[PDB]
Amino acid sequence: ALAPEIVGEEHYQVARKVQQTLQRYKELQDIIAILGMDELSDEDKLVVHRARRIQFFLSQNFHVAEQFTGQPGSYVPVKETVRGFKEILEGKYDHLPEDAFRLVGRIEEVVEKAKAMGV
Amino acid sequence: GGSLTALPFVETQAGDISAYIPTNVISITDGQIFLQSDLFFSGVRPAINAGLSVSRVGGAAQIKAMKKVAGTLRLDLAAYRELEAFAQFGSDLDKATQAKLARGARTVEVLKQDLHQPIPVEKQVLIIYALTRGFLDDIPVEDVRRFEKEFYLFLDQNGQHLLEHIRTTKDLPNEDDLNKAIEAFKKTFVVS
Amino acid sequence: IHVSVVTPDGPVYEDDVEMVSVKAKSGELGILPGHIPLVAPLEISAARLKKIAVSGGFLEVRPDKVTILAQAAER
Amino acid sequence: ASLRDIKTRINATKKTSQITKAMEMVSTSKLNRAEQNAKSFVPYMEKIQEVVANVALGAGGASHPMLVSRPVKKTGYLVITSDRGLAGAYNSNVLRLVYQTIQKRHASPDEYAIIVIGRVGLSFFRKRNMPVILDITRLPDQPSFADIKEIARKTVGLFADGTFDELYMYYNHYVSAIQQEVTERKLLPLTDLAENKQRTVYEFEPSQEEILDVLLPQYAESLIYGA
């Protein structure tokens, strides 16, 4: 059902761009493992910078997992997910720490968690 | 007092010695000789590899002169085999890197040979003695083969007593006489 | 007295001579042993101790020894 | 999970290890040579610093334009970077320091000026849209005075011409083989000069003013080459 005429046109482009950046980050794992991050071009460092944030923002906190961790759990509609990933891809939230993206529902919660982290 | 010596052959595919028969026969014999396909194509005859070849009988199957001569050669080849792949990048430690490279290249050129025409053991001992005692550094790498050939020709005329001493006694001759003979030959050999 | 002519790359000469004569920008001059401390530039010329090229120097006369802080002080 | 893929990955990793080991030994040799060069250079620095400290204090010798502070209107930057990479954070640290210093209090494009020594820094500043004054590159691995004598003389002369009222240089200081510092300082403005307590008054064949006039550029060049 991931077709432009079924889900929309914005959704399709957002998903394709996210997948493309994740694949590009996947291609650079070996050279980061051996050499390091100091031997990369500026565009590659930008790709890694956004890819780590995307990979952490794909996680979530569930209602049935509350008894394990403690967080109440979250529910996100489609439009909010598309909006949040569109903002992430635009470099709007490139200054926040990479750890603020883990185990949250929406992107406003990302902003609140970064605020409570002292930044 | 009789004896019987055996030299079995085993052929591998793509240099894989993990196969069933190759591991079966390796564990029966008293040591193995390894021949590489990389060295054969380049032109090294015979393409023997000393990094994977062993002989568990050892020096008990050798004469006194060869025992006294072969240890330094073994150590030199072992030293040269580690740094052989990095000759493209010079500017290394001038103390003991390019000297070892030159000694190793001179060693590798000495061990080359041609089809048929085997060599007597006294001649092998004398040439390996000349190489190990530092008598070959002046001669460039490209002339080592011709140097050894002309040395063999020289010994047949004016070195007729060192060979007889090695044949009759099985021990290499006096060091000063050997040094004088090698010094005398070098003055005649014209280096290109 | 013994002289020490030094280029920035390193020492150039440490010759010991009985008499020293160093040309200056204002005019040629010789230095007697046990001299008064004198400071003077070096013109582009060949210094002659007489018991070397210099282009850019600085004469630092001191009674204990004479040091020529020359540049590109070839021979 | 085929054995062939694992074998080829092992082969590639082994070849990369060979490359890295070779580069490591070559770099150790080059470090030895560079230390030799610096230790051979030091005596001239010692002598010139001693002489300048001896002469330029007391008994007049003030009011020199090279030594007197001036209302700053344009600033210059001299940076010492490398030509190629394979060095961990050797160039990025100094370039980040230079960028943050420029973006702090150098807003006007005509306010500041840059002169670089390494190609990496030059390309960095081209990508970041800043104007350079001069660029020297492809310097040898064991450079000496004659290599950039002309560049250093041009720099000190253009300061003497009144172009920049302030001069700054940014570079990396070798503390140890592992520890590495990023340091900065003013060079030509010479707001503060050193001194010694063994000074000798001596005599002045061309007078003190001309003596200082000829002496100071040599001091600037010597400091540049030490760095």
Domains along chain A with CATH numbers: 7-117 (1.10.1140.10)
Question: Nearest-CA neighbor of D87 among D167, D23, D144?
Answer: D23
* Spatial CA neighbour of C5 closest among C64, C51, C45, C60: C60
Note the maximum CA span of chain B: 59
Strands C66-69, C3-7: parallel, antiparallel or unpaired by DSSP?
A: parallel
DSSP string, D202-217: -EESS-HHHHHHHHHH
Q: What is the resolution of this structure in A?
A: 2.8
Backbone phi, psi, residue D27, to 5°: -70, -35
Closest CA to B73 of B124, B37, B30, B34: B124
**How many angstroms away from the CA of D168 is the closest CA of chain C?**
23
Q: Which of chain B's residues have a Cβ under 8 Å away from the Cβ of D29?
A: 91-93
Is B192 labelled as part of a ligand binding site?
no
Write down the H helix ranges in B27-171.
Answer: 37-42, 64-83, 98-110, 121-132, 144-158, 162-169
CA atoms within a 13 Å half-sphere pointing along the CA-CB vector of D29: 16
Separation of alpha carbons D12 and B164, rounded Å:
55
Helical packing angle, A10-27 and A42-57, nearest 10°: 120
Q: What is the Cα–Cα distance from B170 to B164, expressed in whole angstroms?
A: 9
- By the 10 Å C-beta count (0-12 exposed, 13-18 middle, 19+ buried), D93 is classed as middle
Q: Please name every residue paired with C20 in a beta bridge, in sequence order, or none if there are none.
A: C31
Annotated ligand binding at B56? The verdict is: yes
C-alpha dist (Å) from residue A87 to A49, A110, B175, D110: 14, 12, 86, 36
What distance in Å separates the CA atoms of residue C61 and residue D78, rounded to the nearest whole number?
35
DSSP 3-state of B189: coil
Joined tokens for residue B11 = 């052929």
Considering only alpha carbons, which residue of chain A is nearest residue D20? A35
Q: How far apart are CA C48 and CA C3, in angstroms?
A: 11
| Cβ-nearest to C6 among D44, D144, D205 | D44
Q: How far D51 CA lies from chain A's nearest CA (Å)?
A: 44
Question: What does the alpha-carbon distance between residue B99 and residue B80 come to, in Å, rounded to a whole number?
Answer: 10
Q: Experimental method used, please?
A: cryo-EM
Distance in angstroms (rounded) separating the CA atoms of residues D47 and D42: 9
Counting Cα atoms < 13 Å in the Cβ hemisphere of D193 gives 25
Q: Which one-letter DSSP state was computed for residue C2? A: B
Spatial distance between the Cα atoms of D195 and D197, rounded to a whole number of angstroms: 7
Establish if B9 touches chain D: CB-CB under 8 angstroms. no
Contact between C42 and C22 under an 8 Å Cβ cutoff? The reply is yes
The residue extents of the domains of chain D are 25-227
Of D18, D26, D30, the CB nearest to B85: D18
For chain D, say whether B61 makes contact (Cβ under 8 Å): no
The dihedrals phi and psi of D119, each to the nearest 5 degrees, come to -70, -35
| D96 contact partners, CB below 8 Å, separation of at least 6 | none
Angle between helices B121-132 and B162-169 (to 10 degrees): 110
Nearest-angstrom CA–CA distance, B102 and D20 = 23
**Rounded-to-integer distance, Cα B141 and Cα B152, Å:** 18
Q: What secondary structure does DSSP assign to chain A, as a single string?
A: ---HHHH-SHHHHHHHHHHHHHHHHHHTHHHHHHT-GGGS-HHHHHHHHHHHHHHHHT----STTTTTS--------HHHHHHHHHHHHTTTT-SS-GGGGSS-SSHHHHHHHHHHTT-
Q: Which of D84, D182, D130, D13 is nearest to A38 (CA)?
A: D84
Torsion of CA B117, B122, B123, B124, to 10 degrees: 80
Residue D23: its chain B contacts at CB < 8 A? Answer: 89
Please name every residue paired with D116 in a beta bridge, in sequence order, or none if there are none: D79, D135
Residue pair D121/D81 in contact (Cβ under 8 Å)? The answer is yes
Burial pattern B131-152, b for ≥16 Cβ within 10 A else e, equals: bbeebbeebeeebbeebbeebe
Q: Which of D46, D49, D66 is nearest to D188 (CA)?
A: D66
CATH classification for the domain delimited by D25-227, as one of 3.30.1330.10, 3.60.15.10, 3.30.70.1230, 3.40.1380.10:
3.40.1380.10
User: Are residues D67 and D195 in contact, defined by beta-carbon separation less than 8 angstroms?
Assistant: no
Cα end-to-end distance, chain C, whole Å: 20
Distance from B98 to chain D by nearest Cα, in Å?
13
Which member of D16, D85, D87 has the closest CB to residue A34? D16
Measured CA to CA, the distance from residue C15 to residue D209 in angstroms comes to: 32
CA C23 to chain centre: 8
Contact yes or no for D26 and B93 at CB 8 A: no
Closest by alpha carbon to D144, among C71, B172, C55? C71
Is B145 one of the catalytic residues? no
B-chain CB neighbours of D7 within 8 Å are none
Q: What is the 3-state secondary structure (H, E, C) of D158-205?
A: HHHCCCCCEEEEEEEEECCCCCEEEEEEECCCCCCCCCCCCCCCCEEC
- Residue A53 Cα to chain centre, angstroms: 4
The 3-state secondary structure of D56-69, one letter per residue: CCCCCCCCCCCCCC
Closest to D72 (Cα-Cα) out of D157, D188, D169, D156: D188
Residues D187 and D224: their CA atoms lie apart, in Å, by 8
Q: Best interface-test mutation with B: which of D28, D29, D142 has the largest number of B CBs within 10 A?
A: D29
Span between the terminal Cα atoms of chain B, in Å: 52
User: CB under 8 Å to C31, separation ≥6 — which residues?
Assistant: C20, C21, C22, C38, C61, C66
CA separation for the pair B32, B24 (Å, rounded): 13
Distance CA D53, CA D20 (A): 47
Chains contacting chain C through 3 or more C-beta pairs under 8 A: D
Rg over alpha carbons for chain B, rounded to the nearest Å, is 19
CA nearest C6: which of C48, C63, C52?
Answer: C52
Compute the distance between CA of residue B138 and CA of residue B144 in angstroms, rounded to an integer. 10
